[PDB]
Design a protein around this ligand. Structure first.
Ligand code: HEM
Ligand code: HEM
Lengths: 458, 461
């Protein structure tokens, strides 16, 4: 038969694998999408998927009656150290429904008002650290952003202080996480994954796993020393039952959820803050306008929940940064039944289809011709944006459970940053997106001149 | 009645050296003083000195008309990396008078009121660090005190942020300083100092010196980026003239003073704070009384200058810690002319005599029979203390120029510590005084339970 979809160059038994022989496979796939079109087939030894890049097809892919969430190989390999976490379970397994019903109350607006204080604590830590630098000292943006987001997720969801700011080096948990992610990404490119030559790598992987487990233990132990304090994730994990089955999460599942949320609740958020600061220093008029909104809204020494909710331009800037470079850049789906996507591409039952979020966010037929320009004003009227054209947090019931958490924290931190400092791109930094499955700017450095605004104690 | 001076066992060409083959030489000399008496002679290859331990002889040694400050071998070896600092120059030389007249205004009571804000800044940093610990986490006392004192001396005297709290490891300057000081202390005890086996050590020494110089440069550079701000010691060093000779300090002398003050204004102070906290956790009733006085006086979120000056019991505790274990434990003097010490020991022109401060502070004929007891109340009436019986900061013109600085900083920090926390000796720590020329407790760890008292803000301009 005649195929209906384009497909890039195959290399024999290696299929399309040699096309991802880079450190930036997501950007390589973005280039392939630029070449072939909205949808194209991609074959690797043992698996076949179809990459979607246009709103026309993705709005049908998000129809939960026709497609459901699939665990692409990256997630299946993350399961080795995250277990059956909330993000690594099929939508139809008991683990997902149980954990979802148990953990969803932890992200209500009341829990947001609760986490606000600790978020402000870590934000104050970051601002003070930047204030206490000497002259002619720069800021390693990604590093301090990871410090802040890790401390925040820890303190807010587990009442545990990582104290990343009291370390001149990255936290060991962060380093082990990055090593594990790099190992997963490399394992995805191995023709013969059971080759003995990879044994060394595998061994190192286990060491990283050890680190993770150790941290979990301490967190659990620390709880037993303090007790139930905030209505955090840990309280609901330990003392929480399913309103349907009446069962609480077992101990192994609790450990899995702990590692999963620790990893998820800080890496992508770090990427978001770094990208936002990059675009702000690269568009001076937007920088000035957001600084004006920050100085206008944030009037108290410490910002309040309502003040963060009134930072509309900060939210628009964050959403535009999410648009241009979604930190979690893709998600996979499978067809529940045979269907015809877009009325032009037939799909069988169980076929794999992956959404290339940056190319969806660059669909000119929906966004315009200025897709590559950082213009947050395009989020002025939220209803003017067509359906399913902006999907940085997933879709449907399997969407990011901490979307409100992440947006609130990032808004607060960026507001305080632009209130208390004025930033300078002292190097003319050329963007370089490093990939550990997720995207993050590497080498981004700026200088900050304090606006000398007092930061009191509350 | 001319007596013959005692002397411990001699070992041939090594003289009394084999008695000091320890890492705690000051404590060994204290034991020798307990055995032999008020005065005893001590010979090392190439040098001879006489150790004094009684108020009767030390009050004559502090007679500036008969004796002047001598640079003992420890200071001559410190000069290798501190240069001709204020503490390392003879009293009669032009360098000391010039540098003294230039730098003395930096320690007036007005300059203290100025430094108070930055002191409170670093103190808030320390308290915040301790509040943010998890349960079942102990406190490395000496490490955090060194953090605080280094950050404070930097911020106050050079407007430079070391940010010792943003490092889980000791600052590299502190590590190089401790290694150089241990090298001086060990070099003073080496039978064969030119033996090839020690060559490596010497090499390491030089590397440390590099570090020092590098830091100095940064400080200078940082000033040129900011300008004359807090009118610190650096302002007086660079833009300061002698009210007598009209000369400003040259550049090499400025670097020497920078390194000298950076080391002096924090090492001994770290030791003082560590010792005081030790004595407080080992005498719970004194701890409670000082905590109560702290809660009475410090009522604002951040303490003020007057509030620090109203903490008399904290000052008495600091002074008792200074008495029992003076962080700088000795100083040397030489006889201007031939004289008769105590009416019993003849001294020639230029003979060396060193004051053993801990034994002076343990002279029962002046302090009582409880010299070994931690009783700060003995500093209630300051006029009740006899003359020349308490010399933790030196004597005469060559006394500690930053004594007010050290006492104010230590009082403020200890007051805030005892206001915001309750301490627990969770290990029943057995005292161990580590010596790198200075004295400081090593291995001291405690736990802190917060009283959950709020802390205020600071502008940080
Ligand atoms: C800018 C920041 C973030 C971005 C772009 C992002 C993106 C995403 C995406 C695309 C998914 C869906 C993956 C899929 O369907 O295969 C997802 C799910 C998820 N996110 Fe995030 N996320 C962010 C921050 C966070 C934070 C702060 C948390 C904190 C708890 C979090 C926790 C989760 C979890 C647990 C899931 C899986 C939930 C489920 O499937 O039931 N994420 N996120
Ligand atoms: C508990 C803390 C301290 C103790 C026990 C202490 C002890 C001493 C002693 C015993 C001397 C006399 C040395 C001798 O006569 O050979 C001295 C001198 C000196 N100290 Fe301190 N000190 C302390 C803190 C400080 C501080 C905070 C500074 C800040 C600058 C400082 C700087 C100096 C200087 C420059 C001299 C030499 C002054 C001169 O000779 O004109 N010290 N100190």
């Amino acid at each position: 038969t005649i195929k209906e979809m384009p497909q890039p160059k195959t290399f024999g038994e290696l299929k399309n694998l040699p096309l991802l022989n880079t450190d930036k496979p997501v950007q390589a796939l973005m280039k392939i999408a630029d070449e072939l079109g909205e949808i194209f087939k991609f074959e690797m030894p043992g698996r076949v998927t179809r990459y979607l890049s246009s709103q026309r097809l993705i709005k049908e892919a998000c129809d939960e009656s026709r497609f459901d969430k699939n665990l692409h190989q990256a997630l299946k390999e993350i399961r080795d150290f995250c277990g059956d976490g909330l993000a690594l379970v099929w939508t139809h397994e008991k683990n997902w429904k149980k954990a979802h019903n148990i953990l969803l109350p932890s992200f209500s607006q009341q829990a947001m008002k609760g986490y606000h204080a600790m978020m402000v604590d870590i934000a104050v830590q970051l601002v003070q650290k930047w204030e206490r630098l000497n002259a002619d000292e720069h800021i390693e943006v990604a590093e301090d952003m990871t410090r802040l987001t890790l401390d925040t997720i820890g303190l807010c969801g587990f009442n545990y202080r990582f104290n990343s700011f009291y370390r001149d080096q990255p936290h060991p948990f962060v380093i082990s996480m990055v090593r594990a992610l790099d190992e997963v990404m490399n394992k995805l490119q191995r023709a013969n994954p059971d080759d003995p030559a990879y044994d060394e790598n595998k061994r190192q992987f286990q060491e990283d796993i050890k680190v993770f487990n150790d941290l979990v233990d301490k967190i659990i132990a620390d709880r037993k020393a303090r007790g139930e304090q905030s209505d955090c994730l840990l309280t609901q994990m330990l003392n929480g039952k399913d309103p349907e089955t009446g069962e609480p999460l077992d101990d192994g599942n609790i450990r899995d959820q702990i590692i999963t949320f620790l990893i998820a609740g800080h890496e992508t958020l770090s990427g978001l803050l770094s990208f936002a600061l990059y675009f702000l220093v690269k568009n001076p008029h937007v920088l000035q306008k957001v600084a004006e909104e920050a100085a206008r809204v944030l009037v108290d020494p410490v910002p309040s929940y309502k003040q963060v909710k009134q930072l509309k331009y900060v939210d628009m800037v964050l959403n535009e940064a999410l648009r241009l470079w979604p930190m979690s850049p893709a998600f996979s789906l499978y067809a529940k039944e045979d269907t015809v996507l877009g009325g032009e591409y037939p799909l069988e039952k169980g076929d794999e289809v992956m959404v290339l979020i940056p190319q969806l966010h660059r669909d000119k037929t929906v966004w315009g011709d200025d897709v590559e320009e950082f213009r947050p004003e395009r989020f002025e009227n939220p209803s003017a944006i067509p359906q399913h054209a902006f999907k940085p947090f997933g879709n449907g019931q399997r969407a990011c459970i901490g979307q409100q958490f992440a947006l609130h924290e990032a808004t607060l931190v960026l507001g305080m940053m632009l209130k208390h400092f004025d930033f300078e791109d002292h190097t003319n930094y050329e963007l370089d997106i490093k990939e550990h499955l997720t995207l993050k700017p590497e080498g981004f450095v700026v200088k900050a001149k304090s606006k000398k605004i007092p930061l009191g104690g509350i």
